[PDB]
Amino acid sequence: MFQKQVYRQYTPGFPGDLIEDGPKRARPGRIMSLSAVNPAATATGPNRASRAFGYAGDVSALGEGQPKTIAARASEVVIGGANFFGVLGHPKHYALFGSAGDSLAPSYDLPDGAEGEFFDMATGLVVEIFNGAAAALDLDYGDLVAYVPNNLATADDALGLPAGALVGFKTGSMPTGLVQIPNARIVNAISLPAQSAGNLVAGVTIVQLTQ
Amino acid sequence: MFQKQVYRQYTPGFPGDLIEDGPKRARPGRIMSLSAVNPAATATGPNRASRAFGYAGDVSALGEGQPKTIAARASEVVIGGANFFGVLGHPKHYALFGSAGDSLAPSYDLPDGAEGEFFDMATGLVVEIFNGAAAALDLDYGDLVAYVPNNLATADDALGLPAGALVGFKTGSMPTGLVQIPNARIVNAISLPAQSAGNLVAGVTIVQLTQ
Amino acid sequence: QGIVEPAGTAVEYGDHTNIPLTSWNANFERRTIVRGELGMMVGTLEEGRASAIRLNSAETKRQQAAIGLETFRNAIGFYGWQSGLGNRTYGFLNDPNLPAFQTPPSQGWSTADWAGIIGDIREAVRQLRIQSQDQIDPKAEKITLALATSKVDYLSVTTPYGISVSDWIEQTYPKMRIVSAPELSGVQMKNQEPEDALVLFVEDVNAAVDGSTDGGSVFSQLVQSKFITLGVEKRAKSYVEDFSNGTAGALCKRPWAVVRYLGI
Amino acid sequence: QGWSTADWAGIIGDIREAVRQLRIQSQDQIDPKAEKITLALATSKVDYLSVTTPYGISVSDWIEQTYPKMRIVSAPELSGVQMKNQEPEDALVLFVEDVNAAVDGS
Amino acid sequence: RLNSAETKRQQAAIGLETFRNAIGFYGWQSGLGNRTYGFLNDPNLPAFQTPPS
Amino acid sequence: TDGGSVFSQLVQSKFITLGVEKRAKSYVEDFSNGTAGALCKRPWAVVRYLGI
Amino acid sequence: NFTAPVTTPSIPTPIQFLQTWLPGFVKVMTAARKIDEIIGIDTVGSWEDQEIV
């Protein structure tokens, strides 16, 4: 939308980009549509970057006759998930793919059946963080993070939250229905304002230590 | 000079040094004077190397007027913090600065406002260990480590343990007032004698795996 | 850096009288050096996709590494680094050996006429001439005016007869140099509004005038390096590069040649 | 508040403030004296540039000599812009024509 | 890295110059009876006055 | 990367001349030397008795 | 079990190194002498003389 203000310095980084170099683990995968989930999904959302994903199944069979050919090792994932399969990242790898209203529009969404890179271990990862309980929250250096499941009950989801959004919380208190990513730390302090249903603040970009 | 005894072998390493090569993580920081803490420090000590340090705040503002320039991303640390930040190490980085009496005197502490490197992950790190139970203790290969906070009550600190010393303990016999470091192991054998207040045996430096 | 400070006094001459002698006495000062770091990483497929839109990914990231380090160095030049914590770095606006800020005769250049603005500069030069006892002549001394970007446009204030502030400055002080900087706009945040600053100082003092072994250099910027390549690490599908720089801040060596105003 | 019922110095201050904003919005990256700035102004207020001091200095002479590269244009669409409580408000727009490639790496 | 002899010699020269300048501005022992006098201390001078402003 | 020797005597100079002053009926000469004592670099190889 | 060192742990590099000394020296300036620019200078007599008439 063009630069309407001149600042003294540039932004540290963008969500989905690695910000520090160190030990790292990532695997490829393919995306399943939410409609294919058998017990139906109570929480829905797009396949947006910088959001958690869950394991779905194995698609390495590649055949239908009596002798099958296993020529590759592949896995497929779902946006919400209950079996953690990393966080989507590295936006420079993919393409715009266009948008519904018009192409050439900014978006982090990815179509179903596309291939992405999901990070399990990362020294520094810029992500988009959310807030729970609809109250002002200060994270500071060492809080934990969790992500919304597909099957989150509507009672525990009063604030409309995406399918796989990342939510930070203090050690003592955690929202009732969430899945905690083991051994993850906030690393970068951040403050978030109060929230309301339908008017959730998107939060601010933040560094992450996935493992 | 100063060598009055001859032993059969060399020491494996010195505290604050890397003893093995592998995955590792470190961050820089600036040390805050312990007197700056508001609720006061019940446990005190110097900024000795191979001691745990805690996050204190952000000092990246770098300005005094209405607009400020965020030139760098820097973190500010204190000798003892509830949020774990790292362990000071790599003594070759710093300068001696002598001592109050005369220069060229052995010193092993850093002054306030100085930089340092703190470790969050290390395959092998030599650190000094302490006994927190005032009794004989044998650690063995697989154990856990913890560090003293400043807000440790004197009732739980009958032994005069320093501000940020590291304490080893068994799986189910952790002291009452310490803070555990997740996924930390001793990965080496060591034995400590009986202990008493005022006659605190400093223990023996031992290898330790941070993460 | 050091100081010389000679001493000695003379008496009347005599054939068989005692001979007076001279001596000296020195002192020293210290500062600290700070280092910065910044790097980059590029993958194989990222470059291929970037070339589709006619953009060089590796070169763009390399340029930002140099720019990011320059911003770190530039900020230290104006404000000290961790001066509150105890680090002895300091900067242009934070040096301890400075004459300290003052309130100008005119309350502010805003809502001030031609006479008010011209009076402020005259007083600053008078203090500079009083402080150094006729050692420097402002007519032919090559003095520098710092000023601020929010106040640099007030030099075009004109009288009803067409005479402007800049006309008087050029004729009275032909060798004066005028600059500006955004970092001098918001300085101390007096009540609820930023306060613009004005710094007047001499660029250099002649060796014959003083006798110092070094140059004049009233203000000096201590830079160890501006851009150093640490190394390149090559991996299977990517490579990483590192860069660094060093600086020590600003040092004021002759505090008697500086005049500064706090409020506009 | 308004160029109407304003003297020569008052009108000059408004033009000075507009030039100051350009040097402030961009952090001292462009100097207005060598940028070929264009002044939009309004039809109902373009005639106020002829205000003169008793000595004989006009507003237009000050602009034409201090900023030789400035261009003055008039347009009727800028007379009634926002249609205030009961009167129209005349607008004034100041902008730079071109930006050099040395200023920014575009 | 400092030469003491050169510094002392320069200081001696500067002190002699200062003495000469002081004698030039103010006379030497004019009250005692010595006839040296100076720019601002000559006994036969029209004496100071006060300006209108 | 040293000569060992356990003990060492640190002597800056044995004999140097300062200057000569000549007078009407005599002259004077001055001399000087410097030393720093003894240093024991390997105290693990010394056995000493106070009596006997 | 880890053996005992024979020397006290310490930071190796003393601060007397790692220092850069600027080549110059700053000298005190004091006031100026300007009698010659006011009244000029003239050589009349010689050293070891007495009076001028």
Residue numbers in the entry:
A (entry chain h), B (entry chain g): 1 to 211
C (entry chain F): 119 to 382
D (entry chain E): 225 to 330
E (entry chain B): 172 to 224
F (entry chain I): 331 to 382
G (entry chain B): 66 to 118
Q: What are the paper's exact sentences on this?
A:
Bacteriophage E217 infects Pseudomonas aeruginosa and is part of an experimental phage cocktail developed to eradicate P. aeruginosa infections in Galleria mellonella (wax moth) larvae and vertebrate models. E217 is a PB1-like Myoviridae of the Pbunavirus genus characterized by a ~66.2 kbp genome, significantly smaller than the classical enterobacteria phage T4 (~169 kbp). Here, we describe the structure of the whole E217 virion before and after DNA ejection at 3.1 Å and 4.5 Å resolution, respectively, determined using cryogenic electron microscopy (cryo-EM). We identify and build de novo structures for 19 unique E217 gene products, resolve the tail genome-ejection machine in both extended and contracted states, and decipher the complete architecture of the baseplate formed by 66 polypeptide chains.
We reconstructed the E217 head using alocalized reconstruction with fivefold symmetry imposed (C5), which yielded 2.8 Å resolution at 0.143 cut-off Fourier Shell Correlation (FSC). The E217 head has a maximum diameter of 790 Å and is built by 535 copies of the major capsid protein gp25. We will refer to the reconstruction of the E217 virion at neutral pH with an extended tail that was determined at an FSC = 0.143 resolution of 2.8 Å, although no significant differences were observed in the E217 head because of alkalization. The first 65 amino acids of gp25 were not visible in the reconstruction, suggesting this moiety could be cleaved during maturation or is disordered in our reconstruction. We found that E217 has a T = 9 icosahedral capsid decorated by gp24, a likely cementing protein stabilizing the E217 capsid. Each gp24 subunit consists of two anti-parallel β-sheets, arranged like the petals of a flower, to form a tulip-like structure. Each E217 gp24 trimer contacts three neighboring decorating proteins and six capsid protein subunits in three adjacent capsomers, burying a total surface area of ~8642 Å2. Gp24 trimers at neighboring threefold/quasi-threefold axes generate an inter-capsomer cage. The interconnected architecture of gp24 trimers is stabilized by extensive van der Waals contacts between N-terminal arms and omega loops.
